[PDB]
């Protein structure tokens, strides 16, 4: 029947013999074990070594496999994705389906994973009760056999499939055979923008329940007006034979203290003309002054559900963590415990560079700690229900969760083709309903989502209403079909900009500020995805947060996204390197578009993370006179683990510093009066830096963790004192080919043919490897490239405009090169035109003034043709001979910062190793810039002015020519790019120009000045 029915090409069959979904069960037979959440003897993990054989299709599976281990099969670890063991290739595609679009059919060549396990079941489980097997995750569809007999079938890669094995198991040795199909009709609802893998990728377990058993339970908590009183309402459902002596006790615990308890026999209230549920009971417990759950303070109680007898004999016990919180939208605002939330969220896929889509505790805990340490309080499960442990950790560490149905049909044309089709309603309904049935008791889940990128169809409205009817405690959201449809309680757009409208037909992305106030619109706005963090990105992040803080109904959003989906590959020498789309022979693919994270795949932070941390701070600061006003954006907690450090520095030189304890109520303010500052006579800018430090360790952070910061300029004393007049005068030497200047052991050489400083000598040592030349281009960022699909070529993308205009191939034509001797200096005057096909793109006019003190003052005035696309940068570059270990600068740092991503950086004296001045983006691009720099030091060299710079062993040319970071080779010496001006990086999205007008280099005329000297 299996090969004949083809259940995997029929959306009307999504399972056979599958048990009903439910909340996490462990079937404890001891109440104390249930209370403490300790292991249950009745719940057994089947994770470990399994037998596995790969086949190109289900027809290729030999019938002997049903009863006998195949000798060709390998021993593998389970849970696993079989692409990670190398049996076939993982595929990265964004929108376009990995299979031909022909529902409900899949390719006849359908990679098939035959898993099997020989295992022992103890005699006790056979005589009495029910033994079920639970597969927490099988991608994408599977048939199940036990001891050669067919058991059932299951679909939906992201939710547990469970089957009764009581009638299939025997004394001693048993064998399970699992035939997993890569493709099925389920694949049409699984078109998420991520790697396409398959296999038994989440836990496998055996659970033993009595015949008379708790089959479901729901915990609800409702509150009075000031949250001083709560009622915990618990509905408990049973299966098995009903008896008059049966009882349910629900008890609520706070540590070892029982705070409330209720006991009742089965028999619900009358529901209709035919009665009520005899097999159900609802317990109501009163709790006075409950401790409330939030992400700020994740207060939890333990509920223990006991199925027992009247005379006091336990049959079984289940349990859950309970967080007392209320979620409601009121007057246009999303409230938690009566207070408006500000969502500092991030989208997080389930990804590991080694293990694929298999999740483990260590990695999950790592992500949560890093999220909380960087001021995130919310996570969206993009775009499927997660590994069950994720919700436990969110409950316990404290994160708001958007739990999202495993439904995405992005690749359909139009996007709603399936979701508007009633024939696909059954498949869709199960992905929503079984999610709710599983996760409804988790306090961390505050919002339900209907899925992702599936247009808006009538099936969405049906399922929206289903959830609203079944669980009034959580809003339902869904972005598809315009982000403000009838299927959503929350205006939840993706990549809607702050001020700029994007008026796409049918599905516009309005300015978020404008969207709120459209005629008739009353709902809160929280972006489900924003600030697309692909490569060198998060330009304009501060603009979002300013708007979130200003507009009550703008309640934040979820950054896209947490972690790069890069996979580990190995070269000839067995050295690991980060791979993306296409690196596995997978075609078609969408290349580096799988990497959009704030962190690298190994959870090393990208520079963008510190900007996110800074903008998402829970303390806001103002300065007036010497008064710092600290405002708390905590809704619930006081600042009981916070002190304020302050320091004043004169151009990086410390002058005064102190600390003050913070005592701010939620939403409150504290005024801190700075002591009288000893002013300096010497010139320069005084800078005040404040930092909020957590003196004590928490569950999620170390002692001394810095949670917030801010800088202000204080007094400036401008330098008026003349530089000490030098005795020596530099000497000009003229030839046909070169102008040469000499002063002591220093020589400067200007090539009269090129018009550039071609060489510098300190004694007989050459300082340059490539001449000092203007640069107007950058190695293109993912944002400049502006591509979401590898097939899509957009003439409007920045990089395409720069290419089409000749920016990358414009050659410098010399217009003027003259030398003059002054009283105490030599003056070199130059002029250059950059042209492409008879069109002058840029003109640079310079003076180099070399005085008797050995300083070269470079003055640069640039013209940019108003009709050429605005250049990526306006500066100079050269390759220095020197390779030094350290880079020292007075400017914004310490991390990479760009003009539209520099709010997190602070002005100070910074000193890093050279390798830290390069950001290892997996797809190489312009990187490592630091802005607002007044002084840069490298080996013998010092540069002074007001510039942006990067410095590394990689030229812009190499960076733009190399597709992977592991293929980069250090060049001879050091490439310095010093910019007068540099373009924003943008990132509102990465598939259209996203750089805001004010960060584009459109002024037409530009001036900057540098002093180069040897200190």
Residue 100 contacts a copy of itself per CB under 8 A = no
Query: Which run of H or of E encompasses 661?
Result: strand 653-661
Q: Min. distance of Cβ 995 from Na ion in angstroms?
A: 18
Q: At closest approach, how far in Å is the CB of 472 from a copy of itself? A: 11
Listed ranges 446-454, 792-800, 885-893, 903-911: which one lies at the site for Mg ion (CB under 5 A): 446-454
Q: Applying CB under 5 A, does 672 fall inside the site for Na ion?
A: no
User: Which one from 162, 529, 642, 800 is the annotated catalytic residue?
Assistant: 529
Strand order in the sheet with 301-309: 257-264, 246-254, 301-309, 314-322
Residues 6 or more apart in contact with residue 876 via CB below 8 angstroms: 772, 773, 774, 775, 858, 860, 977, 978, 979, 1010
Cβ of residue 374: shortest distance to Na ion, in angstroms? 20
Number of residues interacting with Mg ion: please give it, by CB under 5 A.
7
Binding Na ion by CB under 5 A: which of 554, 567, 599, 931? 554
Selection from Na ion, a copy of itself, Mg ion, none that 514 binds (CB < 5 to 8 A by kind) is none
500 in active site: no
d(CA 378, CA 399): 5
Q: Helix, strand, or coil here: 514?
A: helix
Nearer to a copy of itself, 470 or 762 (CB): 470
**In 128-282, where does DSSP find H-type helix?**
none
Contact pick of 193, 529, 586, 896 for Mg ion (by CB under 5 A)? 193
Round to whole Å and give the CA distance between 261 and 55: 55
Long-range CB contacts for residues 719-727, cutoff 8 Å, separation at least 24:
719/683, 719/684, 720/683, 721/683, 723/853, 724/853, 725/824, 726/824, 726/851, 726/852, 726/853, 727/852
* Contact predicate 315/215, CB 8 Å: no
| Rounded CA separation 612/367 (Å) | 15
Return the SS3 of 813.
Answer: strand
Q: Binding to Na ion by residue 786, rule CB under 5 A? A: no
The phi and psi torsions of 534 (rounded to 5 degrees) equal -80, 115
Burial of 329 (0-12, 13-18, 19+ CB in 10 A): middle
Residue 185 touches Mg ion, criterion: CB under 5 A: yes
Indicate whether 10 belongs to the interface with Mg ion (CB under 5 A). yes
Task: Report whether 233 belongs to an annotated binding site.
Answer: no
- Write out the binding residues for a copy of itself, residues 331-350 only, by CB under 8 A: none
- Does position 596 interact with Na ion (CB under 5 A)? The reply is yes
Applying CB under 5 A, among 321, 404, 439, 453 the residue interacting with Mg ion is: 453
Q: What is the smallest separation between the CB atom of 504 and Mg ion, expressed in angstroms?
A: 16
SS3 522: coil
Structure tokens at 566: 């890069």
Token pair 């033993």 in the structure block, residue = 208
Q: Among 237-245, 266-274, 331-339, 767-775, which window interacts with a copy of itself (CB under 8 A)?
A: 266-274
Q: Which is nearer to a copy of itself, 56 or 276 (CB)?
A: 276
Given 350, 404, 453, 642, which residue is catalytic? 453
Q: Which residues lie below 8 Å from residue 434, measured CB to CB, with a gap of 6+?
A: 21, 156, 159
Q: How many CB atoms lie within 10 A of CB 332?
A: 16
Tell me the longest C-alpha to C-alpha distance in the chain.
113
Task: Say whether residue 924 binds Na ion (CB under 5 A).
Answer: yes
Binding piece for a copy of itself, criterion CB under 8 A, among 29-37, 155-163, 273-281, 343-351: 273-281
Q: For the CB of residue 178, give the shortest distance to Mg ion in the complex, in Å.
A: 16
Binning the chain into helix, strand and coil, the percentages to the nearest 5 are 15, 40, 45
| Residue of 247, 246, 245, 262 whose CA lies nearest to 303 | 262
- Does residue 17 touch Mg ion according to CB under 5 A? no
Residue 435 makes contact with a copy of itself by CB under 8 A:
no
| Candidate residues 68, 242, 271, 706; the one interacting with a copy of itself per rule CB under 8 A | 271
Nearer to Mg ion, 596 or 758 (CB): 596
Encoded tokens for 368: 């949560």
Distance of CA 489 to the CA centre of its chain: 24
Residues 7-36, interacting with a copy of itself (CB under 8 A): 10, 12-16, 20
Tokens of 197: 């893998």
725: DSSP letter = P
Between 7 and 420, CB nearer to Mg ion: 7
Residue number, 405 or 876, with CB nearest to Mg ion: 405
| Between 160 and 924, CB nearer to Na ion | 924
Distance CA 466, CA 470 (A): 6
Is there a catalytic annotation at residue 529? yes
The span from the CA of 200 to the CA of 306, in Å, is 33
Restricting to residues 368-427, which ones interact with a copy of itself according to CB under 8 A? 410-417, 422-423, 425-426
> In the 8-state DSSP scheme, what is residue 868?
S
Q: Where are the beta strands (DSSP E) in 475-575?
A: 476-477, 525-530, 554-559, 567-570
185 binds, among Mg ion, Na ion, a copy of itself, none (CB under 5 to 8 A by kind): Mg ion
* Residue 16 interacts with which of a copy of itself, Na ion, Mg ion, none, CB < 5 to 8 Å by class: a copy of itself
Q: Give bridge partners of residue 1006 from the DSSP assignment.
A: 862
Closest CA to 639 of 617, 616, 660, 662: 662
Find the binder of a copy of itself among 226, 241, 273, 736 (CB under 8 A). Answer: 273
331 is in an annotated binding site: no
138-139/199-200 β-pairing: antiparallel
Smallest gap from Cβ 589 to Na ion, in A, equals 12
Partner that binds at residue 105, options Na ion, Mg ion, a copy of itself, none, CB closer than 5 to 8 Å by kind: none
Q: Which of residues 460-479 bind a copy of itself (CB under 8 A)?
A: 461-466, 468-470
Least distance to a copy of itself, CB of residue 434, Å: 8
802 a known binding residue?
no
Please work out, in degrees rounded to the nearest 5, the angle formed at the alpha carbon of residue 785 by the alpha carbons of 780 and 790: 130
Chain center to CA of 979: 30
Min separation Cβ 216 and a copy of itself, Å: 11
Residue closer to a copy of itself by CB (options 185, 926) is 185
Out of 47, 147, 263, 429, the only residue in the binding site for a copy of itself (CB under 8 A) is 429
Give the whole-angstrom CA distance, residue 669 versus residue 676.
22
Per-residue interface string for the shown chain with a copy of itself, residues 225-264, x marking contact by CB under 8 A: ----------------------------------------
**Binding site listing for Na(+):** 193, 593, 596
Which positions touch Mg ion (CB under 5 A)?
A: 7, 10, 13, 185, 193, 410, 453
Which positions touch a copy of itself (CB under 8 A)?
A: 1, 4-5, 10, 12-16, 20, 269-278, 410-417, 422-423, 425-426, 429-430, 433-434, 437, 453, 455-456, 458-459, 461-466, 468-470, 480-482, 486, 504-507
Which positions touch Na ion (CB under 5 A)?
A: 193, 548, 554, 593, 596, 924
**Binding site listing:** 94, 193, 408, 410, 453, 529-532, 589, 593, 596, 991
Active site positions, annotated: 453, 529
**Binding site listing for Mg(2+):** 408, 410, 453, 589
């Amino acid at each position: 029947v299996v090969l004949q029915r083809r259940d995997w090409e029929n959306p009307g069959v999504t399972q056979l013999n599958r048990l009903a979904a439910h909340p996490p069960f462990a079937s404890w037979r001891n109440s104390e074990e249930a209370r403490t959440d300790r292991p249950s003897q009745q719940l057994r993990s089947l994770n470990g070594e399994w037998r596995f054989a790969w086949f190109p299709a289900p027809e290729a599976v030999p019938e002997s496999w049903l009863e006998c281990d195949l000798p060709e099969a390998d021993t593998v670890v389970v849970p696993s994705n079989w692409q990670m063991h190398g049996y076939d290739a993982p595929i990265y595609t964004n929108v376009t389906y990995p299979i031909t679009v022909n529902p409900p059919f899949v390719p006849t060549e359908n990679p098939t994973g035959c898993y099997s396990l020989t295992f022992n079941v103890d005699e006790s489980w056979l005589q009495e009760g029910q033994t079920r097997i639970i597969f927490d995750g099988v991608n994408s569809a599977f048939h199940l056999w036990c001891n050669g007999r067919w058991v059932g079938y299951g679909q939906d890669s992201r939710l547990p499939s469970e089957f009764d094995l009581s009638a299939f198991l025997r004394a001693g040795e048993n064998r399970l055979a699992v035939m997993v199909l890569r493709w099925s009709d389920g694949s049409y609802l699984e078109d998420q923008d991520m790697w396409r893998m398959s296999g038994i990728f989440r836990d496998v377990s055996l659970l033993h329940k009595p015949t008379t058993q708790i089959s479901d339970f729901h915990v609800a908590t409702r509150f009075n007006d000031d949250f001083s009183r709560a009622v915990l309402e618990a509905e408990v459902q049973m299966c098995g034979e009903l008896r008059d002596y049966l009882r349910v006790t629900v008890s609520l615990w706070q540590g070892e203290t029982q705070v409330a308890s209720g006991t009742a026999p089965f028999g619900g209230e009358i529901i209709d003309e035919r009665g009520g549920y005899a097999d159900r009971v609802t317990l109501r417990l009163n709790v006075e002054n409950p401790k409330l759950w939030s992400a700020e303070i994740p207060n939890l109680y333990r509920a223990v559900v006991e199925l027992h007898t009247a005379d006091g004999t336990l049959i079984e016990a289940e349990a859950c963590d309970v967080g007392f919180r209320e979620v409601r939208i009121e007057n246009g605002l999303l409230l938690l415990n009566g207070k408006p939330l500000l969502i500092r969220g991030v989208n997080r896929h389930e990804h590991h560079p080694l293990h694929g889509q298999v999740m483990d505790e260590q990695t999950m805990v790592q992500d949560i700690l890093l999220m909380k340490q960087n001021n995130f309080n919310a996570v969206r499960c993009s775009h499927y229900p997660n590994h069950p442990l994720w919700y436990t950790l969110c409950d316990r560490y404290g994160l708001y969760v958007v739990d999202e149905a495993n439904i995405e049909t992005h690749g359909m044309v139009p996007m709603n083709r399936l979701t508007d089709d009633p024939r696909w309603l059954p498949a869709m309904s199960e992905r929503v309903t079984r999610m709710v049935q599983r996760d409804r008791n988790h306090p961390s889940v505050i919002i339900w989502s209907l899925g992702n990128e599936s247009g808006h169809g009538a099936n969405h409205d049906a399922l929206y209403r289903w959830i609203k009817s079944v669980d009034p405690s959580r809003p339902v959201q869904y972005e598809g079909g315009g982000a403000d449809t009838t299927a959503t309680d929350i205006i939840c757009p993706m990549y809607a900009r702050v001020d700029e409208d994007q008026p796409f037909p049918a599905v516009p992305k309005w300015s978020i500020k404008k969207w709120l106030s459209l005629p008739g619109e009353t709902r809160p706005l929280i972006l489900c995805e924003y600030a697309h963090a692909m490569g060198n990105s998060l330009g304009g992040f501060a603009k979002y947060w300013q708007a979130f803080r200003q507009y009550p109904r703008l309640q934040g959003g979820f950054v896209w996204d947490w972690v790069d989906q890069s996979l580990i590959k190995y070269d000839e020498n067995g050295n690991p390197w980060s791979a993306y789309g296409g690196d596995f022979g997978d075609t078609p693919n969408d290349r580096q578009f799988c990497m959009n994270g704030l962190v690298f795949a190994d959870r090393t932070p990208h520079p963008a993370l510190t900007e996110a941390k800074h903008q998402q701070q829970f303390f806001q600061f103002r300065l007036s006179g010497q008064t710092i006003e600290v405002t708390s954006e905590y809704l619930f907690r006081h600042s009981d683990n916070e002190l304020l450090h302050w320091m004043v520095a004169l151009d990086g030189k410390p002058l005064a510093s102190g600390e003050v304890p913070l005592d701010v109520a939620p939403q409150g303010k504290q005024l801190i009066e700075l002591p009288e500052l000893p002013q300096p006579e010497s010139a320069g800018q005084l800078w005040l830096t404040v930092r909020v430090v957590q003196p004590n360790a928490t569950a999620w952070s170390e002692a001394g963790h810095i949670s917030a910061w801010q800088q202000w300029r204080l007094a400036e004393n401008l330098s008026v004192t003349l530089p000490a007049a030098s005795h020596a005068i530099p000497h000009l030497t003229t030839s046909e080919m070169d102008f040469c200047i000499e002063l002591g052991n220093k020589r400067w050489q200007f090539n009269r043919q090129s018009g550039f400083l071609s060489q510098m000598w300190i004694g007989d040592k050459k300082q340059l490897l490539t001449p000092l030349r203007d640069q107007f281009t950058r190695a293109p960022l993912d944002n400049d490239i502006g591509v979401a699909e590898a097939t899509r070529i957009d003439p409007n993308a920045w990089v395409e405009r720069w290419k089409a205009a000749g920016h990358y191939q414009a050659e410098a034509a010399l217009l003027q090169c003259t030398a003059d001797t002054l009283a105490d200096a030599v003056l070199i005057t130059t002029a250059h035109a950059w042209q492409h096909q008879g069109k002058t793109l840029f003109i640079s006019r310079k003076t180099y003034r070399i005085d008797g003190s050995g300083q070269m003052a470079i003055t640069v005035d640039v013209e940019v043709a108003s009709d050429t696309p605005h250049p990526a940068r306006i500066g100079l570059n050269c390759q220095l001979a020197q390779v030094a270990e350290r880079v020292n600068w007075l400017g914004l740092g310490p991390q990479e910062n760009y003009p539209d991503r520099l709010t997190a950086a602070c002005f100070d004296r910074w000193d890093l190793p050279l390798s830290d001045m390069y950001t290892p983006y997996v797809f190489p691009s312009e990187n490592g810039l630091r802005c607002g720099t007044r002084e840069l030091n490298y080996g013998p060299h010092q540069w002074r002015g007001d510039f942006q710079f990067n410095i590394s062993r990689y030229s812009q040319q190499q960076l733009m020519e190399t597709s992977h970071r592991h293929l980069l080779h250090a060049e001879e010496g050091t490439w310095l790019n010093i910019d007068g001006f540099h373009m924003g990086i943008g990132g509102d999205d990465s598939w259209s120009p996203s750089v805001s007008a004010e960060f584009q280099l459109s002024a037409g005329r530009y001036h900057y000045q540098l002093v180069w000297c040897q200190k």
